[PDB]
Design an enzyme around this catalytic site. Structure first.
Site, PDB file in Angstrom:
ATOM      1  CB  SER A 171      -0.892   0.065   1.249  1.00 39.37           C
ATOM      2  OG  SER A 171      -1.829  -0.994   1.315  1.00 39.37           O
TER       3      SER A 171
ATOM      4  CG  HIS B 107      -1.866  -0.957  -4.825  1.00 36.00           C
ATOM      5  ND1 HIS B 107      -2.074   0.393  -4.622  1.00 36.00           N
ATOM      6  CD2 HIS B 107      -2.286  -1.577  -3.695  1.00 36.00           C
ATOM      7  CE1 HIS B 107      -2.594   0.579  -3.423  1.00 36.00           C
ATOM      8  NE2 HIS B 107      -2.732  -0.599  -2.839  1.00 36.00           N
TER       9      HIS B 107
ATOM     10  CD  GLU C  25      -2.543   3.032  -7.395  1.00 39.85           C
ATOM     11  OE1 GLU C  25      -2.137   2.450  -6.367  1.00 39.85           O
ATOM     12  OE2 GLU C  25      -2.710   4.276  -7.448  1.00 39.85           O
TER      13      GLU C  25
ATOM     14  CG  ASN D  88      -3.134   3.580  -0.774  1.00 36.16           C
ATOM     15  OD1 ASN D  88      -4.354   3.508  -0.584  1.00 36.16           O
ATOM     16  ND2 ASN D  88      -2.376   2.507  -0.974  1.00 36.16           N
TER      17      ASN D  88
HETATM   18  C1  LIG Z   1      -5.000   0.613   1.385  1.00 31.55           C
HETATM   19  C2  LIG Z   1      -4.570   0.371  -0.079  1.00 31.55           C
HETATM   20  O1  LIG Z   1      -3.430   0.002  -0.324  1.00 31.55           O
HETATM   21  C3  LIG Z   1      -5.597   0.427  -1.229  1.00 31.55           C
HETATM   22  C4  LIG Z   1      -7.087   0.309  -0.926  1.00 31.55           C
HETATM   23  O2  LIG Z   1      -7.741  -0.651  -1.350  1.00 31.55           O
HETATM   24  S1  LIG Z   1      -7.933   1.740  -0.205  1.00 31.55           S
HETATM   25  C5  LIG Z   1      -9.704   1.344  -0.076  1.00 31.55           C
HETATM   26  C6  LIG Z   1     -10.297   1.302  -1.494  1.00 31.55           C
HETATM   27  N1  LIG Z   1     -11.614   0.817  -1.437  1.00 31.55           N
HETATM   28  C7  LIG Z   1     -12.698   1.677  -1.194  1.00 31.55           C
HETATM   29  O3  LIG Z   1     -12.498   2.880  -0.956  1.00 31.55           O
HETATM   30  C8  LIG Z   1     -14.034   1.076  -0.975  1.00 31.55           C
HETATM   31  C9  LIG Z   1     -15.135   2.161  -0.900  1.00 31.55           C
HETATM   32  N2  LIG Z   1     -16.383   1.533  -0.777  1.00 31.55           N
HETATM   33  C10 LIG Z   1     -17.095   1.063  -1.903  1.00 31.55           C
HETATM   34  O4  LIG Z   1     -16.737   1.342  -3.056  1.00 31.55           O
HETATM   35  C11 LIG Z   1     -18.379   0.241  -1.675  1.00 31.55           C
HETATM   36  O5  LIG Z   1     -18.874   0.550  -0.361  1.00 31.55           O
HETATM   37  C12 LIG Z   1     -18.142  -1.317  -1.819  1.00 31.55           C
HETATM   38  C13 LIG Z   1     -17.498  -1.663  -3.182  1.00 31.55           C
HETATM   39  C14 LIG Z   1     -17.227  -1.836  -0.683  1.00 31.55           C
HETATM   40  C15 LIG Z   1     -19.493  -2.067  -1.773  1.00 31.55           C
HETATM   41  O6  LIG Z   1     -20.388  -1.472  -0.834  1.00 31.55           O
HETATM   42  P1  LIG Z   1     -21.930  -1.500  -1.117  1.00 31.55           P
HETATM   43  O7  LIG Z   1     -22.270  -0.516  -2.155  1.00 31.55           O
HETATM   44  O8  LIG Z   1     -22.639  -1.177   0.128  1.00 31.55           O
HETATM   45  O9  LIG Z   1     -22.295  -2.936  -1.638  1.00 31.55           O
HETATM   46  P2  LIG Z   1     -22.978  -4.074  -0.771  1.00 31.55           P
HETATM   47  O10 LIG Z   1     -24.218  -3.396  -0.347  1.00 31.55           O
HETATM   48  O11 LIG Z   1     -21.901  -4.310   0.214  1.00 31.55           O
HETATM   49  O12 LIG Z   1     -23.210  -5.148  -1.991  1.00 31.55           O
HETATM   50  C16 LIG Z   1     -23.843  -4.717  -3.207  1.00 31.55           C
HETATM   51  C17 LIG Z   1     -22.919  -4.956  -4.422  1.00 31.55           C
HETATM   52  O13 LIG Z   1     -21.531  -4.987  -4.052  1.00 31.55           O
HETATM   53  C18 LIG Z   1     -20.997  -6.310  -4.248  1.00 31.55           C
HETATM   54  N3  LIG Z   1     -20.083  -6.770  -3.230  1.00 31.55           N
HETATM   55  C19 LIG Z   1     -19.698  -6.081  -2.063  1.00 31.55           C
HETATM   56  N4  LIG Z   1     -18.623  -6.736  -1.441  1.00 31.55           N
HETATM   57  C20 LIG Z   1     -18.330  -7.842  -2.243  1.00 31.55           C
HETATM   58  C21 LIG Z   1     -17.313  -8.826  -2.188  1.00 31.55           C
HETATM   59  N5  LIG Z   1     -16.340  -8.834  -1.141  1.00 31.55           N
HETATM   60  N6  LIG Z   1     -17.248  -9.824  -3.193  1.00 31.55           N
HETATM   61  C22 LIG Z   1     -18.155  -9.885  -4.281  1.00 31.55           C
HETATM   62  N7  LIG Z   1     -19.155  -8.884  -4.328  1.00 31.55           N
HETATM   63  C23 LIG Z   1     -19.234  -7.888  -3.322  1.00 31.55           C
HETATM   64  C24 LIG Z   1     -22.157  -7.258  -4.631  1.00 31.55           C
HETATM   65  O14 LIG Z   1     -21.811  -8.215  -5.638  1.00 31.55           O
HETATM   66  C25 LIG Z   1     -23.308  -6.314  -5.024  1.00 31.55           C
HETATM   67  O15 LIG Z   1     -23.811  -6.304  -6.370  1.00 31.55           O
HETATM   68  P3  LIG Z   1     -25.300  -5.804  -6.571  1.00 31.55           P
HETATM   69  O16 LIG Z   1     -25.359  -4.333  -6.548  1.00 31.55           O
HETATM   70  O17 LIG Z   1     -25.751  -6.199  -7.915  1.00 31.55           O
HETATM   71  O18 LIG Z   1     -26.247  -6.324  -5.567  1.00 31.55           O
HETATM   72  N1  LIG Z   2      -6.602  -3.734   3.423  1.00 27.62           N
HETATM   73  C1  LIG Z   2      -6.636  -3.096   2.242  1.00 27.62           C
HETATM   74  O1  LIG Z   2      -7.651  -2.442   1.921  1.00 27.62           O
HETATM   75  C2  LIG Z   2      -5.519  -3.115   1.282  1.00 27.62           C
HETATM   76  C3  LIG Z   2      -5.676  -2.925  -0.202  1.00 27.62           C
HETATM   77  C4  LIG Z   2      -4.451  -3.008  -1.048  1.00 27.62           C
HETATM   78  C5  LIG Z   2      -3.282  -3.368  -0.550  1.00 27.62           C
HETATM   79  N2  LIG Z   2      -3.142  -3.732   0.827  1.00 27.62           N
HETATM   80  C6  LIG Z   2      -1.816  -4.181   1.209  1.00 27.62           C
HETATM   81  O2  LIG Z   2      -1.854  -5.562   1.008  1.00 27.62           O
HETATM   82  C7  LIG Z   2      -1.072  -6.297   1.985  1.00 27.62           C
HETATM   83  C8  LIG Z   2      -2.167  -7.205   2.460  1.00 27.62           C
HETATM   84  O3  LIG Z   2      -2.984  -6.569   3.441  1.00 27.62           O
HETATM   85  P1  LIG Z   2      -4.337  -7.269   3.870  1.00 27.62           P
HETATM   86  O4  LIG Z   2      -5.401  -6.280   4.114  1.00 27.62           O
HETATM   87  O5  LIG Z   2      -4.841  -8.396   3.044  1.00 27.62           O
HETATM   88  O6  LIG Z   2      -4.053  -7.812   5.387  1.00 27.62           O
HETATM   89  P2  LIG Z   2      -4.554  -8.995   6.243  1.00 27.62           P
HETATM   90  O7  LIG Z   2      -4.030  -8.746   7.607  1.00 27.62           O
HETATM   91  O8  LIG Z   2      -6.027  -9.110   6.094  1.00 27.62           O
HETATM   92  O9  LIG Z   2      -3.898 -10.339   5.637  1.00 27.62           O
HETATM   93  C9  LIG Z   2      -2.477 -10.613   5.642  1.00 27.62           C
HETATM   94  C10 LIG Z   2      -2.208 -12.006   5.585  1.00 27.62           C
HETATM   95  O10 LIG Z   2      -0.767 -12.140   5.538  1.00 27.62           O
HETATM   96  C11 LIG Z   2      -0.394 -13.320   6.191  1.00 27.62           C
HETATM   97  N3  LIG Z   2       1.046 -13.224   6.436  1.00 27.62           N
HETATM   98  C12 LIG Z   2       1.711 -12.368   7.263  1.00 27.62           C
HETATM   99  N4  LIG Z   2       3.036 -12.508   7.250  1.00 27.62           N
HETATM  100  C13 LIG Z   2       3.234 -13.534   6.349  1.00 27.62           C
HETATM  101  C14 LIG Z   2       4.398 -14.173   5.865  1.00 27.62           C
HETATM  102  N5  LIG Z   2       5.621 -13.856   6.237  1.00 27.62           N
HETATM  103  N6  LIG Z   2       4.288 -15.186   4.945  1.00 27.62           N
HETATM  104  C15 LIG Z   2       3.030 -15.552   4.520  1.00 27.62           C
HETATM  105  N7  LIG Z   2       1.887 -15.015   4.915  1.00 27.62           N
HETATM  106  C16 LIG Z   2       2.033 -14.011   5.828  1.00 27.62           C
HETATM  107  C17 LIG Z   2      -1.314 -13.347   7.401  1.00 27.62           C
HETATM  108  O11 LIG Z   2      -1.434 -14.654   8.014  1.00 27.62           O
HETATM  109  C18 LIG Z   2      -2.637 -12.819   6.808  1.00 27.62           C
HETATM  110  O12 LIG Z   2      -3.599 -13.815   6.423  1.00 27.62           O
HETATM  111  C19 LIG Z   2      -0.440  -5.202   2.835  1.00 27.62           C
HETATM  112  O13 LIG Z   2       0.839  -4.894   2.271  1.00 27.62           O
HETATM  113  C20 LIG Z   2      -1.391  -4.002   2.650  1.00 27.62           C
HETATM  114  O14 LIG Z   2      -0.758  -2.735   2.895  1.00 27.62           O
HETATM  115  C21 LIG Z   2      -4.241  -3.749   1.692  1.00 27.62           C
END
Ligand SMILES: CC(=O)CC(=O)SCCNC(=O)CCNC(=O)[C@H](O)C(C)(C)COP(=O)(O)OP(=O)(O)OC[C@H]1O[C@@H](n2cnc3c(N)ncnc32)[C@H](O)[C@@H]1OP(=O)(O)O
Ligand SMILES: NC(=O)c1ccc[n+]([C@@H]2O[C@H](COP(=O)([O-])OP(=O)(O)OC[C@H]3O[C@@H](n4cnc5c(N)ncnc54)[C@H](O)[C@@H]3O)[C@@H](O)[C@H]2O)c1
Ligand SMILES: CC(=O)CC(=O)SCCNC(=O)CCNC(=O)[C@H](O)C(C)(C)COP(=O)(O)OP(=O)(O)OC[C@H]1O[C@@H](n2cnc3c(N)ncnc32)[C@H](O)[C@@H]1OP(=O)(O)O
Ligand SMILES: NC(=O)c1ccc[n+]([C@@H]2O[C@H](COP(=O)([O-])OP(=O)(O)OC[C@H]3O[C@@H](n4cnc5c(N)ncnc54)[C@H](O)[C@@H]3O)[C@@H](O)[C@H]2O)c1
EC number: 1.1.1.35
Lengths: 291, 291
Positions: free
Chosen positions: A126, A147, A159, A197
């Site tokens: 991330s 990503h 990404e 992010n």
């Molecule tokens: C940290 C990093 O490194 C990077 C990251 O990822 S940052 C976070 C990025 N992600 C976001 O910001 C998520 C923002 N939230 C959203 O876009 C939406 O809330 C969401 C996609 C999570 C779904 O929420 P929602 O609208 O309430 O859907 P929900 O009510 O949960 O389900 C409805 C739909 O979503 C789908 N759905 C939700 N979760 C699902 C899952 N885990 N698997 C399969 N389908 C899923 C269903 O298939 C469904 O389809 P229909 O509309 O036809 O019924």
């Molecule tokens: N949570 C998010 O929305 C998001 C989205 C994109 C990327 N990421 C990135 O993806 C990675 C995964 O995060 P996540 O949310 O799935 O976390 P998570 O905590 O849900 O899952 C991580 C998994 O890694 C396993 N693990 C830890 N150390 C390990 C090792 N040495 N060898 C093998 N398995 C090991 C754990 O048992 C666990 O099941 C992180 O680098 C995070 O920053 C997370």
């Protein structure tokens, strides 16, 4: 010009499980890896549940087609507790383990010895620098960032991050793979947080700071962002959804990198929740309580 | 305990026209005020197009009822270039003019002299202090913030801002009015940017900075935020939608009151577009060009 067919997904958590699910659903041979058989069994159960939800909606008017989709996809996902035993014959490694540089480098340094010569290494990190993880191996030309976004079965963005060392051949294979997964790849520079992010996380931290200041409740802030900005999720709902532990690691990393930058000042509330093992939805409780 | 029925809206731009439209569509008598007769004509024309769309989608199978709806709504919207005379007797004055403290204070100080005693004054300001504008009058108990979101006919949120001087009666009347408009009121403290803008604006500025830093194109950043975070609009599209001039005024204001805060650092790219009178959709061109 290698065509990715066999994918080894390391980590069966929130992201790894989703990546394995989509890869398998799109015809790729998948091996999901994690620390124990119990963890893997739980990941499998989660994937099955997700697949059925997809099936109820994508095959609403054809239950048999729904059954076959779920069964076929699950049977395409093998599991192993040691990735090193799998990589000598895999085309791509997609790492999705804990957000910790040392741990990721240790992992890739080890796999580099077992993986086939053509094997491409990709991190789903991330906030870490791809170049830093790549140098833990001697395979930099076949190392890049891939990503995905949470939840993987839904978010279309992917990404694709090249380092100055990534070869064009490796880059194109990853772009082709992204499209094979039915995703929309966007090439990004190897800069902290890439695109999403770098803009999203600081915003989420500001949401937390506004709350800690006592200016507004988490509930009203979520309502406000959803109804005023049209966001699918309020910031606290999203924080719990992403995982508070992962969020903390992201910001600590950047904070250490630029100590005086206001964007990355750690949050006492976030650190306390993480310290109390309340990581969000994945643990049943974060800023909010779940079932 | 006044029940808002007759509403005076000052400013017929993006927000003022929208507020007039919804108040009238919900049965309130409205008087829209602006500077010239040509501006008012354009404002009322735009409200008609918005209604023609709200009709085809709410009265699709009933074409005639659609026209009646559009005609009756427009009829309940009077126009005028003389606010001083219109406010003699009105229940609520909702100001939606240029985001500039001095100009807003001068307006309310003057109207405070022509409005009936029971009249409530409310500012739709994005980032200024309600307490500051209220003290430009001697009607502070009847002064508060009533902040709508763009586009008003769609966004459900309305931030209701009490100053330490706003009476409970004034507050309640505004809450009741918000609901009468079919909106979802959220009471907010009088802090800069309240809830949404305090979190949204700095994020939009960070998006611009990422582009200025040369890390990514505006197109990819928008694509990434929409496909990765599920946002309805990419930051650059939203900036143009909101208005680049307004965004600049908001930030310059916060910058002035805290010059050493890096989060309110103005943008050369933003200032250049504003200097060239390219405010976004407003003028047909901003970061992007519009037909
Ligand atoms: C940290 C990093 O490194 C990077 C990251 O990822 S940052 C976070 C990025 N992600 C976001 O910001 C998520 C923002 N939230 C959203 O876009 C939406 O809330 C969401 C996609 C999570 C779904 O929420 P929602 O609208 O309430 O859907 P929900 O009510 O949960 O389900 C409805 C739909 O979503 C789908 N759905 C939700 N979760 C699902 C899952 N885990 N698997 C399969 N389908 C899923 C269903 O298939 C469904 O389809 P229909 O509309 O036809 O019924
Ligand atoms: N949570 C998010 O929305 C998001 C989205 C994109 C990327 N990421 C990135 O993806 C990675 C995964 O995060 P996540 O949310 O799935 O976390 P998570 O905590 O849900 O899952 C991580 C998994 O890694 C396993 N693990 C830890 N150390 C390990 C090792 N040495 N060898 C093998 N398995 C090991 C754990 O048992 C666990 O099941 C992180 O680098 C995070 O920053 C997370
Ligand atoms: C600066 C401050 O002080 C405060 C602020 O307001 S900050 C900015 C806050 N606003 C936002 O963040 C805007 C974010 N964007 C959005 O939520 C959405 O893009 C949007 C509401 C503008 C519409 O986007 P969209 O999905 O592309 O819809 P669009 O394709 O434009 O139209 C589809 C629907 O919206 C409606 N719509 C859009 N604009 C409309 C308008 N001005 N009037 C009436 N209806 C409209 C249509 O009637 C339509 O209904 P249907 O789905 O049934 O057909
Ligand atoms: N653009 C947005 O998305 C958004 C949303 C909420 C609040 N706001 C705030 O609302 C206000 C309205 O902004 P807007 O987008 O509608 O801008 P706008 O530029 O589209 O409209 C402003 C209108 O004010 C008129 N005006 C200026 N001085 C006036 C005066 N003395 N008397 C009467 N009319 C006068 C102008 O002629 C113009 O039509 C600003 O304070 C802004 O910060 C904007």
């Amino acid at each position: 010009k290698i065509i990715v067919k066999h994918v080894t997904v390391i980590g069966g958590g929130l992201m790894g499980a989703g990546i394995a699910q989509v890869a398998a659903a799109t015809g790729h041979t998948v091996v999901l890896v994690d620390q124990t058989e119990d963890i893997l069994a739980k990941s499998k159960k989660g994937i099955e549940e997700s697949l059925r939800k997809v099936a109820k909606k994508k095959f609403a008017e054809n239950p048999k087609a729904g059954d076959e989709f779920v069964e076929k996809t699950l049977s395409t996902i093998a599991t192993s507790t040691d990735a090193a035993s799998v990589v000598h014959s895999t085309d791509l490694v997609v790492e999705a383990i804990v957000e910790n540089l040392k741990v990721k480098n240790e992992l890739f340094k080890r796999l580099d010895k077992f993986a086939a010569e053509h094997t491409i290494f990709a991190s789903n990190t991330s906030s870490l620098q791809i170049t830093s993880i790549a140098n833990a191996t001697t395979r930099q030309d076949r190392f890049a960032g891939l990503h995905f976004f949470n939840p993987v079965p839904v978010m279309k963005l992917v990404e694709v991050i090249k380092t100055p060392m990534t070869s064009q051949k490796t880059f194109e294979s990853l772009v082709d793979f992204s499209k094979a997964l039915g995703k929309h790849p966007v090439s990004c520079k190897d800069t902290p947080g890439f695109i999403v992010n770098r803009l999203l996380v600081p915003y989420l931290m500001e949401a937390i700071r506004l709350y800690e200041r006592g200016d507004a409740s988490k509930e009203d802030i979520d309502t406000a962002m959803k109804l005023g900005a049209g966001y699918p999720m309020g910031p606290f709902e999203l924080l719990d959804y992403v995982g508070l532990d992962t969020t903390k690691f992201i910001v600590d990393g950047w904070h250490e990198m630029d100590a005086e930058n206001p964007l990355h000042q750690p949050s006492p509330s976030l650190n306390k929740l993480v310290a109390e093992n309340k990581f969000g939805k994945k643990t049943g409780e974060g800023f909010y309580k779940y079932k």
